[PDB]
Design a protein around this motif. Sequence first.
Motif, PDB file in Angstrom:
ATOM      1  N   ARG A 227       8.300 -10.328   3.201  1.00 43.20           N
ATOM      2  CA  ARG A 227       8.457 -11.510   4.044  1.00 43.20           C
ATOM      3  C   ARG A 227       8.449 -12.797   3.223  1.00 43.20           C
ATOM      4  N   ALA A 228       7.633 -12.847   2.166  1.00 41.39           N
ATOM      5  CA  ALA A 228       7.540 -14.051   1.344  1.00 41.39           C
ATOM      6  C   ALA A 228       8.746 -14.205   0.423  1.00 41.39           C
ATOM      7  N   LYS A 229       9.448 -13.108   0.133  1.00 41.64           N
ATOM      8  CA  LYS A 229      10.648 -13.185  -0.691  1.00 41.64           C
ATOM      9  C   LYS A 229      11.911 -13.396   0.139  1.00 41.64           C
ATOM     10  N   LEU A 230      11.812 -13.371   1.465  1.00 35.51           N
ATOM     11  CA  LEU A 230      12.951 -13.678   2.321  1.00 35.51           C
ATOM     12  C   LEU A 230      12.966 -15.117   2.816  1.00 35.51           C
ATOM     13  N   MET A 231      12.220 -16.022   2.174  1.00 33.43           N
ATOM     14  CA  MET A 231      12.298 -17.432   2.543  1.00 33.43           C
ATOM     15  C   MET A 231      13.549 -18.092   1.973  1.00 33.43           C
ATOM     16  N   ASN A 232      13.925 -17.743   0.739  1.00 34.77           N
ATOM     17  CA  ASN A 232      15.132 -18.319   0.154  1.00 34.77           C
ATOM     18  C   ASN A 232      16.392 -17.642   0.680  1.00 34.77           C
ATOM     19  N   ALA A 233      16.266 -16.427   1.215  1.00 30.18           N
ATOM     20  CA  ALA A 233      17.412 -15.766   1.832  1.00 30.18           C
ATOM     21  C   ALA A 233      17.599 -16.220   3.274  1.00 30.18           C
ATOM     22  N   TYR A 234      16.558 -16.082   4.097  1.00 24.07           N
ATOM     23  CA  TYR A 234      16.590 -16.458   5.511  1.00 24.07           C
ATOM     24  C   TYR A 234      15.578 -17.576   5.729  1.00 24.07           C
ATOM     25  N   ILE A 238      13.035 -16.062   9.912  1.00 22.08           N
ATOM     26  CA  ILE A 238      11.806 -15.287   9.799  1.00 22.08           C
ATOM     27  C   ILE A 238      10.631 -16.250   9.692  1.00 22.08           C
ATOM     28  N   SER A 239       9.616 -16.046  10.536  1.00 20.50           N
ATOM     29  CA  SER A 239       8.417 -16.872  10.509  1.00 20.50           C
ATOM     30  C   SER A 239       7.436 -16.343   9.461  1.00 20.50           C
ATOM     31  N   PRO A 240       6.722 -17.228   8.751  1.00 19.57           N
ATOM     32  CA  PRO A 240       5.748 -16.751   7.755  1.00 19.57           C
ATOM     33  C   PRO A 240       4.465 -16.198   8.357  1.00 19.57           C
ATOM     34  N   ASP A 579      -2.989 -11.285  -6.382  1.00 18.05           N
ATOM     35  CA  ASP A 579      -2.986 -12.641  -6.924  1.00 18.05           C
ATOM     36  C   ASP A 579      -1.757 -13.431  -6.489  1.00 18.05           C
ATOM     37  N   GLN A 580      -0.688 -12.753  -6.072  1.00 18.18           N
ATOM     38  CA  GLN A 580       0.482 -13.461  -5.570  1.00 18.18           C
ATOM     39  C   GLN A 580       0.405 -13.732  -4.073  1.00 18.18           C
ATOM     40  N   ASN A 581      -0.624 -13.224  -3.393  1.00 20.52           N
ATOM     41  CA  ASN A 581      -0.798 -13.407  -1.957  1.00 20.52           C
ATOM     42  C   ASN A 581      -1.983 -14.329  -1.650  1.00 20.52           C
ATOM     43  N   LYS A 582      -2.161 -15.390  -2.442  1.00 17.04           N
ATOM     44  CA  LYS A 582      -3.324 -16.251  -2.246  1.00 17.04           C
ATOM     45  C   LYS A 582      -3.097 -17.248  -1.116  1.00 17.04           C
ATOM     46  N   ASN A 583      -1.843 -17.626  -0.867  1.00 12.34           N
ATOM     47  CA  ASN A 583      -1.537 -18.696   0.070  1.00 12.34           C
ATOM     48  C   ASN A 583      -0.729 -18.236   1.276  1.00 12.34           C
ATOM     49  N   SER A 584      -0.259 -16.992   1.290  1.00 13.65           N
ATOM     50  CA  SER A 584       0.522 -16.485   2.411  1.00 13.65           C
ATOM     51  C   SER A 584      -0.415 -15.895   3.464  1.00 13.65           C
ATOM     52  N   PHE A 585       0.161 -15.336   4.526  1.00 21.18           N
ATOM     53  CA  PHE A 585      -0.600 -14.782   5.642  1.00 21.18           C
ATOM     54  C   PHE A 585      -0.718 -13.277   5.439  1.00 21.18           C
ATOM     55  N   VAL A 586      -1.944 -12.776   5.459  1.00 21.75           N
ATOM     56  CA  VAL A 586      -2.211 -11.351   5.307  1.00 21.75           C
ATOM     57  C   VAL A 586      -2.093 -10.677   6.667  1.00 21.75           C
ATOM     58  N   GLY A 587      -1.266  -9.635   6.732  1.00 31.08           N
ATOM     59  CA  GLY A 587      -1.115  -8.890   7.968  1.00 31.08           C
ATOM     60  C   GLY A 587       0.010  -9.428   8.839  1.00 31.08           C
ATOM     61  N   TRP A 588      -0.142  -9.232  10.144  1.00 31.15           N
ATOM     62  CA  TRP A 588       0.854  -9.664  11.119  1.00 31.15           C
ATOM     63  C   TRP A 588       0.125 -10.134  12.374  1.00 31.15           C
ATOM     64  N   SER A 589       0.894 -10.572  13.368  1.00 35.64           N
ATOM     65  CA  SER A 589       0.335 -11.080  14.612  1.00 35.64           C
ATOM     66  C   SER A 589       1.312 -10.793  15.745  1.00 35.64           C
ATOM     67  N   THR A 590       0.792 -10.808  16.971  1.00 38.44           N
ATOM     68  CA  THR A 590       1.533 -10.390  18.157  1.00 38.44           C
ATOM     69  C   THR A 590       1.946 -11.573  19.029  1.00 38.44           C
ATOM     70  N   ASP A 591       2.344 -12.683  18.407  1.00 33.98           N
ATOM     71  CA  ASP A 591       2.764 -13.866  19.148  1.00 33.98           C
ATOM     72  C   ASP A 591       4.193 -14.312  18.867  1.00 33.98           C
ATOM     73  N   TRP A 592       4.770 -13.918  17.734  1.00 30.70           N
ATOM     74  CA  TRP A 592       6.103 -14.372  17.365  1.00 30.70           C
ATOM     75  C   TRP A 592       7.170 -13.440  17.926  1.00 30.70           C
ATOM     76  N   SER A 593       8.215 -14.036  18.506  1.00 29.26           N
ATOM     77  CA  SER A 593       9.342 -13.297  19.042  1.00 29.26           C
ATOM     78  C   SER A 593      10.611 -14.090  18.754  1.00 29.26           C
ATOM     79  N   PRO A 594      11.700 -13.432  18.341  1.00 28.45           N
ATOM     80  CA  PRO A 594      12.940 -14.180  18.069  1.00 28.45           C
ATOM     81  C   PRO A 594      13.669 -14.626  19.324  1.00 28.45           C
ATOM     82  N   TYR A 595      13.465 -13.950  20.454  1.00 26.90           N
ATOM     83  CA  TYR A 595      14.098 -14.351  21.703  1.00 26.90           C
ATOM     84  C   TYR A 595      13.240 -15.309  22.520  1.00 26.90           C
ATOM     85  N   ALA A 596      12.073 -15.703  22.012  1.00 25.45           N
ATOM     86  CA  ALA A 596      11.203 -16.654  22.703  1.00 25.45           C
ATOM     87  C   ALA A 596      11.430 -18.070  22.168  1.00 25.45           C
ATOM     88  N   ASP A 597      12.641 -18.567  22.395  1.00 26.37           N
ATOM     89  CA  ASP A 597      13.018 -19.901  21.946  1.00 26.37           C
ATOM     90  C   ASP A 597      12.749 -20.940  23.030  1.00 26.37           C
TER      91      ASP A 597
END
Lengths: 597, 242
Positions: A227-234, A238-240, A579-597
């Motif tokens: 997910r952290a490497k798809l910021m420059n692609a998408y 994709i939400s972080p 050590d490369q995951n110091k500032n990103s979000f660990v895990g996932w969450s059940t609130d983000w949806s792509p059709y919930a615009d």
Amino acid sequence: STIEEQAKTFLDKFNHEAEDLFYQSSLASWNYNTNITEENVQNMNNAGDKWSAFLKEQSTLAQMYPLQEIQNLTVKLQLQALQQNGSSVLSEDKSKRLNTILNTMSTIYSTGKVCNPDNPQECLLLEPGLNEIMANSLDYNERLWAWESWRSEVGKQLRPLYEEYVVLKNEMARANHYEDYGDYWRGDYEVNGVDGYDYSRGQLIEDVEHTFEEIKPLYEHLHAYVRAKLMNAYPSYISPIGCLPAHLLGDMWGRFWTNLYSLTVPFGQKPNIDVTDAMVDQAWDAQRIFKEAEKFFVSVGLPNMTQGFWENSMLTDPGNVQKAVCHPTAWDLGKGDFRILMCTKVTMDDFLTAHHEMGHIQYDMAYAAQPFLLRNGANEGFHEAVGEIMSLSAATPKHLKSIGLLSPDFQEDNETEINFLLKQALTIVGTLPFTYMLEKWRWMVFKGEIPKDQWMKKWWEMKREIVGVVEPVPHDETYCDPASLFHVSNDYSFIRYYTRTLYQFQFQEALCQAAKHEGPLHKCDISNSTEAGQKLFNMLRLGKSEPWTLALENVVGAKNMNVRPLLNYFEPLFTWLKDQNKNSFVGWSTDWSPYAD
Amino acid sequence: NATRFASVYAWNRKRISNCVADYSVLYNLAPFFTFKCYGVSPTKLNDLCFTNVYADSFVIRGDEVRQIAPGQTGNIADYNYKLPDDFTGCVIAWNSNKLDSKVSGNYNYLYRLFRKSNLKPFERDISTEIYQAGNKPCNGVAGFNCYFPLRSYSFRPTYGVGHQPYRVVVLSFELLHAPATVCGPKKSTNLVKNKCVNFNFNGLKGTGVLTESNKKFLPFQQFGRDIADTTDAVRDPQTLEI
């Protein structure tokens, strides 16, 4: 006349045409995969129906007097694979309708035709077409079509076709003194007759849950790295914080993560380990690629192969006139023989499957003098778990130096093995929670505790808390997302891929403790050791004469299914993702949806 | 080198008695697949021989050649045939992919895998008995825990090393108190004349000079004696000459 003297005489007129009526459908299915003619398909049908009637002719004449008079342990362990009646306990209108619904379920999966509804004037073929356009298309609207429409034209009529298929499948197993069809896949895992090593079918529900708790720190760090490497692609798709979308995992569903390797490269300055550029200079052919791969079987301590393997099986495609289907399947055709049909190319993925498909030959070689009910795996996933021990040992850079493959002075630092281990992480760890949430979905729709409206609403709610994906469009109760695969449409077991990654790791963690290897386990190679075969030879010859609980005692010594070989195989992967995951979000969450615009 | 064979429970008895065995075209040429046996080595069979030789003709899998052993237990060795502890024969196997096989399945000769009890060595059991393992009888049909024995072959030459048609000819040797009748080949040398040499004949041993004889003889004789009871004549074992 005595009750204690009579042990077992079933294998005279059962175990000699259990192979032989399957033999007449063996080569007729093998000539179907080499010579697709108009009369090489008809010999599969009339000979396969004789073997399909052979399992039902002896089942109707085996209905007299019960089981509990047996004393020997060798009698009971082969009796479970024959007393399953199958479909022959239903009526004439109900049992034969199951045979017709299985032939219309595999036809539209292979001969499907779905394409773009905006411009339908050019409409393409599915299976060579859509498998390879997923890797190169770097567009959000292009990857939205290949995932949504495939379950919208093929999977639209399977939803009124799978609902009465589950209902008839409960009747054939509840009459077979079982609770459901959910333990029919767990019926091979049922161990009875040995004191202290009893493994019931209700014990398997907590055992997959027990090995899933310690993989949640390992999977959620791989969930946060792609997910952290798809910021420059998408950048704006994709939400972080939330989950990744499911239509960009690289394949049709997201079982394998193999096409997401070239976009998530950690360091682009160093080259990957590659056999493809060094193969065309030395001019290898089809005779070399199996002979030095069979040199890997002699050096552990397994004996040689005679001339029947070289003049019967071919490795080259027989001309461009006749079509030959070349899916990698090791042909277990009955009482210990193997003819290999593989369309070999100059490909590293073709080179590792040469050790994979020959690893299912070496398991069935040792119990070739055993009966056919004992000529199987210890479970359904035991056959392919002992096959890929030769492929992970051949992807080791210490093995490639002894033959004469790669450069003799190759640098090996700590940043070299990490790009190899994240390639194995999307092959082994990347399919491990995806095997969990579909088998738990199979164990929740067979018992019938849920209504018809929660049949597909429970599928997309599990994927946002187990594997961490979310669908871009919502589905109603007329579509099917899990039922568009290879194993579910042709009625194959899906439990065999969760035990493939578990029993393979238990054997390779202890194999070079006999061969005395110091270091990590991804540098472990089992070659040049004659005492490394003797730990395997009592395990390769036990088949189903001994169960899987006593089969693990001679290599690892654990009677239960553990997760501890899966942890210290990836010990740079647990430390260098931290050590490369110091500032990103660990895990996932059940609130983000792509059709919930 | 026959074109047909028999079942492993329907073993014919090829009674080899009063013969001269020629192993220079069979053992020394060796056109078979494997040539390995126990008890007696095949190089000792040219210099040692036995009373009665019995042979058979049966084609089995390549997995059942480990079962053919003296003192063996397992799948074939207690239920189809049994080799005794005094087995002085040899077991030769040969792949017969071009002769003994048949297309569309080989449905003619039958074999077993289990039995009611442990059979005797060299037992010809061709029974079609009705089994009963439990407490309720079967009246001639199979059942739950009731089974029946008798099924045929699965031979085809397109597969690997496991169950190809391997023609196994067990040449069983037996030495009894009767004198020997079937003995193998032995080499010959050249014959020199007019020299003081030693004699190693078929029934003579000595030292003398071979000259041309001018006397009469009987062709069923081995030697002759003079008026002083000394051996002064020898018949050649190959040619009719003294």
